[model samples]
Target chain A: MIETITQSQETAILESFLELVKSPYGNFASIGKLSHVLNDPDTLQKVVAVLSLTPQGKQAFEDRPMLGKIDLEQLHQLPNYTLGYMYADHMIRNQLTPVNHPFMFLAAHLGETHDIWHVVTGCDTDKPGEVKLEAFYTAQLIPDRLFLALLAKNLLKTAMYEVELCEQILDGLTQGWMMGKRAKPLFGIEWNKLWETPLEELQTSLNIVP
Target chain B: ITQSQETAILESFLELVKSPYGNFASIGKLSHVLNDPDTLQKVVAVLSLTPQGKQAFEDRPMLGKIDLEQLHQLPNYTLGYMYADHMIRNQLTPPPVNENVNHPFMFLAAHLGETHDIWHVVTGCDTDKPGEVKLEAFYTAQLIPDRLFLALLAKNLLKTAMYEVELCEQILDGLTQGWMMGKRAKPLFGIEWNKLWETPLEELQTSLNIVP
Candidate 1:
């Protein structure tokens, strides 16, 4: 049955997914739509549960920092392998902005932890590699319809452009997927406290492979 | 597969397919991935396809090398201030490595990294998510070898698949026009962006065969 965009519509959300697949890249045009789907109570609660697993994570859950607290330049002055340096290096290099929808705190939280995740997962800053990392995120993070949509749509396109080197492309994605499964819960760790922690030690404590 | 192996595999399989959000977090991720040999080679080859591109690449001019003070003296329509202004606003620093890694592809990579925003301006793509995606699509259509562009293309397509967006026409335009324009134009990275500051943007496009 055709899905309607309504509480009056039983299959509206599913239909929205169909529409999203139809038109995916207009400035993240369908992001709000995806956010609606993401606003599932169970999934949101699952995030809380995962964060609650560690004391640092639980504290992080209770306290949120303003985006301004992330000073990319100052962070750059820190040691190379340190979290602050890596994050600072990334932000300054890319000229990333701190602005997003003021209302989208959940999305913002995910954004806040983004660089830290890169540090934790041993993912690099390259675009192609990042695509693989996204796959890893899908694997390690909870199952969400959003990630599945991206994996199916994005990875297939990767398979297309990467005609000759497709194997490596798939290999990286597969590796990322496996890594996510084997890696420990990364959602709630108080990354701020661990800024000074050695990259290797952090990786080991977190049960990460690379 | 053994039971343990099967379970891990299945769990991994299920996990990677799960949905998520926040492409916003990809800043660091995108930075690290742009330097692959194939990607730089495509850029290098594309530049060689045109004389202007060839000169630009051979010289390897830096966008950041443009004298902003001199740029300020140019007439209002010059692209110099526009680019310089963007650099200032973003507080862009020098390239990641002061010394060139002993590879030409690294040169191309570093150069491309520096000029990414410059391409956005020249192509008329904005700086927002839509603009970035449009630019990425344009690069893919132009046959840039970076996997990130294709991955982004797929990601954008997923966004399309999941929601009804207004920029459907724009996105399609980006894919088709971006490709056609790129196919028609010389190597984007090869243009001497600094010299073009005073050149009428229109004349510059005409000289270079840029559609926009």
Candidate 2:
């Protein structure tokens, strides 16, 4: 029966979306990167061979509309937040492939979006092991692990030269990096905490601005 | 707050990054381990594209063990963790902006940075080990409830081809323990964690996982 799918279909998709994430490929996530990292003499090779081809590895790239979605003039006039949300909303709707759920859609969106930030903010996926650093520091307070905290702090000094504020990095350390209990006087929280502050503040207070 | 182990680890991390597998042998020898069936099986299962679910993988150049330090040395290369802490410390903290932060892009990027680790715990990722990146694959694929966090992890670890996957199983086990409040419920933090005070080098992972 060739029935019909309207807006009702949209909500219908939402309810059952959770079912998709439970699949085999879906069950294990970071398989792609592990393949590259473990690529060495002492490690395994067959996994890397398979990893290079997993369809789950497809990249959903966003291409700006050529003629503009609602006319460039009107689109530009939109409020910054509105414009962003609208574009984001549009992308989330169109760019999303048939996969898991809206939540996963959102996650993939964020994953792709940070690359844009690297261009805008200067700090990116790397920037002194920021990913690992964030992961390390985040695990510290959220899990309240000292070794993780130390790993976070240690990662900080290495990349301290990347950003202007060591204090900000220190702030990340002192504030509880991930979602965990607050650190003592000093700790790491998140990178944005350090990024938002003016560099001059660090130079004056923490003596870290250069 | 500071400890000798922390100091030593931090000091040596730089050198370790240069040749992370040096403990076993030269970087060349270590690089060869990437093919080990035990490790690679998990890595490929988690990261690669297949006929069933296809997507090459998102890219995150800055997240590599090497590039992170390189990016940090740049002038504007501030970290999301540092920025998040500052906002929390100062009264300027906005109210959990993860739902929306597109206006001020960098700060939003910072927002992503803020909850970065939540995914680690929620998804059972142990950042400390090389075999745990499989957690990232599960995350990027959206198998877990924490979608935004998983995406962020995927983007962050994209450069490495696959995140550590072997260790992910162990992390998952602990996550279940944390979530179910199993044997660990008897103690303050839990079984594995209550004993974690002494610094279990072989243990003491900081991630947890639970399914609703």
Candidate 3:
């Protein structure tokens, strides 16, 4: 469900991702730039149309949940095995904040859940892991052209520069794609409420292998 | 005597010229231009020539209403913040989007209105008389065949020459510079600027090739 992006847009997206991968803390600014490109009205409307196919997706789209500011201190106090604790730990370890104030519904949803998905899918925050997540997102039918472009760009970059990691990257992509295909639609799941649930229990309920 | 629509546009144009610094009369003229169906149809025809323009016309995207507070929350370097800051600093309120007007012209007008200040920011044009003429000239170049904007440019130049004699040279220079800049830059009409709010102002300017 990837949409077509213009040459200028593709250049900008690639530049932003290059900046993104260079930073260990994950550049919010670069992510913010990417968000702007993806939030095109026509592209967003297409995403809405595709997502509205399922009742859960429709409701989620309508609700347009935003992840405002996250209180890490509170989440960190939760039980160790709880999803909240895991998510909080991940945020603290990476020193990342929730992606906030997205204008579109799909953007908001993705922004809120991206980190949660990382935790649930057991995807690391490394370059290889990001590529795998892109593959995973593609399989789940997420309508992000940037993700698809990034996946293709990564493959090219890996093949040319990082030849040694090519096998590992391809393996990760395959695993992520298969896992995403077998799992239920992840977009509609009410992840905010599920934070208190044990990580293992939530993973089992959502049919997440990780 | 010209048509009633022309007369109305002329009257507003005169009002705008009379108080070059006043936004109210400028809005009056803009409204007159936006409300004219014939002019709008011509604009739509001009826009339909390009693939992106044609798509934008078909989609008819309307910004509807803008939330200043939300825009203010954007990061400092972003286009959103620049726009919000400019509006607040200048005490300019965005004109309401005409949701009632279903025509392609209305959608285009609404988008233009919302992004007017942004154009100024990106182009590095001041809000003074010379700058206004320059921006208007730039706009005229962007929509070359559209006589309405061209007419507006001519009217401004004429008035500036006749009434504001001292500023004529500067305005003329501005006209040439703006026209060249607009001609050189990428087409700005079809871009969904709302998506680029979080993008840095410099990046946007670079992307559009706005040298100013």
Candidate 4:
């Protein structure tokens, strides 16, 4: 099905986007509306096409398995710092829960894939690092209100208080943006296949190398 | 009113403590634990003791429906908005949907989730470990349905004993103050709390007979 958003609703998305980034604690529900703005069938088809390029990604699409539906306790039995472990850790630490919504199937997939990006990008889990990770995603994904607000909030704080990081952080932002532009659209990647894959090989396989 | 910790409920409560944050299972059991009419009636009996409690039972406001943005729209960023803000930051959600249950108990579970933040407001408890332990002690005083109050009480004591945390005074204070306030204040169960949103924070506390 085709998805579309009105100007007013678009503006609403933008403000909710800004609100989430500025707040210290997250409002995961803010992105609940993003499914409306982005997850059209046309876009999903493109996502499917990109995902099909990878053998495992292709399988992930065919199966179309959902993330965060599994119990974290079960995942704890997986080896340390693997994709499954990292993903489970992030969810537990952040106290995240997948929201229930009517049109959120595709959008929620993108939302839950966030921790995978953390592992792939070598981004720090701290606030400033999280901002740059959003910058990287902002570069790849077109529905960017969420990422843009995150980028703005982090950049402003680092710029005002942590001058020493200005050049280093900006370099990270630029590299993430450029790398996103260069890489495959990763939203539909069947990340489950890579859960236990060595991080080095996984990064290389995806050409996400620095 | 009299209540007994049914052996089955106590077993479930023990399981809940093992993995409080492991998943939704801990609190899911809490709903089951509090599911008894005998236990729930004591909560209602306490509510019947106060006009606010009676009104709350009648109104049966669903805590899940309180929206953060709408709360923000209330005049002057009042206590209600602050409470709502706290709920959002802490990610407080409503009781799980259980079709098998009905009023007073349903109200009890829903109100349990809803009243937590408000209790912090009324008790001046912080969200830190000591504050939490104190609030648990306070709940013990308030006569909430089951041994969960005592559950938190035991957990905190074990935590302090096992860990090197330096919150002894605060935990002790929490117990004393919780006991005092639980004894002094009106039954928290039946208040139409959403109605108290715009009421001045101090005045609301004062009206509720909560003391520092």
Candidate 5:
């Protein structure tokens, strides 16, 4: 059963979710709204509880670091194969930018690490790839009903409209799930310091299969 | 002795001021001031005197609730992002106002309840005791010219002197800055904030002539 969401919140979530499903690639605002509606003090407190188990996580929880506006030009200038270079390349390829001013500390951390996760996991920037990355996120993070709902919706849509891609989608989901379960927790890591680290070395050190 | 409504407002205001939460106390108590029928009618009547206030009363715009997740995704420079950041950083959420209230004054109160932090951000107030005093000064200067709020400000200043004596200068500074800024800025109550979510915050402040 769904949690006790107020009527107005439910309406807002549905509207934003529908916008998100309609234009999965473009509507970041709807994504923002969904996150806003889903998050609460309890959730944040729980997140802190979970992350505080580790020294790095505790520091991250306390600092609530924000990337602010990313200097893309600076990132692009990093050496080849570095996390920063790859991240810059990924953004340029996808025409995406890092979430500059996140509303919450957790959201900021998640947004900052999103594309980095994509790069580390070797997930493509396509629709199926995005699904896999989300699956990975679900496996790594706490129980996220929103992500689960999106995954279910995606499966339903794929089954209905893109019948031929069902096997590929399922495969991607399984791969992501396995990868996420096998790897170290990504949430608490201070990625800004790791931008200069080699992507391959970082992946191996973190036990990330991709 | 004053009327029952005035007494209720004063008591509630006093309770909030005296509480340990201090300036950061839930605005619900102050919002309760409007719950009194006489007070609500008087407030509406006074607000309706101005064209912008009258327009706001007629429109009764609701910002609804903020979704921090969605706001977090917005570009950092936008008003939406800054507002979201402020709320998240401070661990604050909008005060709970009765959305079902049918009266125009209640609508106005609900709107104010929802946008109280937005005012803090727009006015560059810190959400500290001094910052709250500043915002109150601004509020008094800009929209509600009520003696009740003026008295609230006075009580805060007096309380500061008695307890946190070091903050007296800052409190006075806030009062002066906020009063001046409120008078100088454009009418804030009439603006549609939802439409301006994507607009750069600096642009909005500049256009509004808000020095803060």
Candidate 6:
């Protein structure tokens, strides 16, 4: 059958799917769950600091394969399993192809690792009600697309998201990452005052939609 | 497919082998191509995702209700943020003769940095590793799209891959199909684009694996 799903239909589907993900006991894909948890960037960062990038992580990526050269103290601190999986995955991928498509591949790595960023920075990887907030996420994100209609309206903040997205993106760039900046999502508004609100309050305030 | 297609692909690959250290060669070639209106025009026409194309994508799924303006706004803000804070703060050694901590490469790095990611999102590549390498080569394999291509690149919303492979391939397909015809973006993600640009309409008969 020749098929086409209108915007309304698609939204309905998405909304329904989201509801299923949050039902009394219907476990959805881990991605939805993990995404919700990893939503908190700050906590993830601290965890990474302790387990992976700490002394242990730096050492793993160091000159010594078994227990190579690296910043001893920092190496000892990373989140073992979390960063362990992240770094290993990163290393394996880059190592597999080397620099064949360095930039593109790295972008992919960085893009996926955005979850890692969540885990390390503690951007809410496993918060309970957080997964239920996908609608809010989408609503907030609508502004990113709002530009076509209101191009100049939020130029400044748009510019700032560029700053934050890349600020985290350019990390470990020495790992042969390459790519032209294709259009990307604006960053979550971690405004200067973002820190002022405690995580719980911010979580509550952030959950509500306009 | 054809000599030119093979030539561009082989040369880019050979060039990669030629300078395995970093992305200097590809960068220079791209810089040259991007800076020159003629070559760039061909490049854009061949591979870029156009504004009209972006417009066509409204309300598409998997793609989400993608906002063209939001997509466009991404590059500049992404770069602006990277530059002012991170790159400048994280340089090593001396100013490398410039006496300034940040140099053209860093600026260039910040500038071109976001393009690949943006392409992935727009094209709906899962922001992951295997997906990234494939897309990188995909991007380089063909050319840039029309107006929106340059517009996105210029805005710092998009940068070329720093050193990834397969980007050219993924992106080439993206510009050819996604932007040109939205929604159908998903299947087009891995669809090979052999359409050679501007060399001659005659070249159209053969598959395109263009690079330069």
Which candidate wins on DockQ? 1
- Give each candidate's interface RMSD in Å: 11.5, 16.9, 26.7, 24.5, 27.7, 16.6
lDDT of 5 by residue, A8-60 (tens): 75456555544554454535576677667654444455555766788877777
Q: Residue-wise lDDT of candidate 2 within B125-192, one digit each (tens)?
A: 34453323333334323321222222222222221222232332244233223233322211111022
Q: Candidate 6, which segments miss by more than 4 Å at Cα?
A: A1-210, B1-13, B18-25, B30-36, B43-113, B121-129, B137-183, B186-212
Least accurate stretch of 10 residues (summed lDDT) in model 1 chain B? B9-18
DockQ, each predicted model: 0.07, 0.02, 0.01, 0.01, 0.01, 0.01
lDDT of 4 by residue, B108-205 (tens): 76677657778887667777767776676577667644444544454453233222123433544565466567767766665666667787777777
Candidates in order have lDDT scores of 0.55, 0.29, 0.66, 0.57, 0.66, 0.29
TM-score values for chain B across all models: 0.67, 0.23, 0.80, 0.75, 0.83, 0.28
**Regarding TM-score, does 4 or 6 come out ahead?**
4
Instruction: Name the runs in model 5 displaced over 4 angstroms.
Output: A1-210, B1-14, B21-46, B49-51, B94-98
- lDDT per residue for candidate 5 within B32-126, as digits (tens), equals 55334554575677767779778877777777656777987899999989988998999987565346646775676667667778888887889
lDDT of 6 by residue, B85-203 (tens): 22234331111222221432233223233333334433333433334433433343323321212222212211112222123334333333322233212222212121211123223
The better-scoring model by lDDT among 1 and 4 is 4
Quality of candidate 2 docking, DockQ: 0.02
lDDT of 1 by residue, A11-105 (tens): 45444543444443332556456555643544455545655667755665566543446666677778887766766676677666442322244
Residue pairs that clash (backbone atoms under 3 angstroms), model 4: B52-B190, B53-B190
Better of 3 and 4 by lDDT: 3
Task: Place model 2 in a CAPRI quality band.
Answer: incorrect
Candidate 3 DockQ, CA atoms: 0.01
Itemize residue pairs with steric clashes in candidate 3. none
Model 4: residues with Cα > 4 Å off, grouped in runs:
A1-210, B1-24, B30-36, B73-77, B91-101
Per-residue lDDT tens digits for candidate 2, residues A16-114, read: 222221222221233223212222222223222332233322222121111112333343344544423333344344343212532233234434443
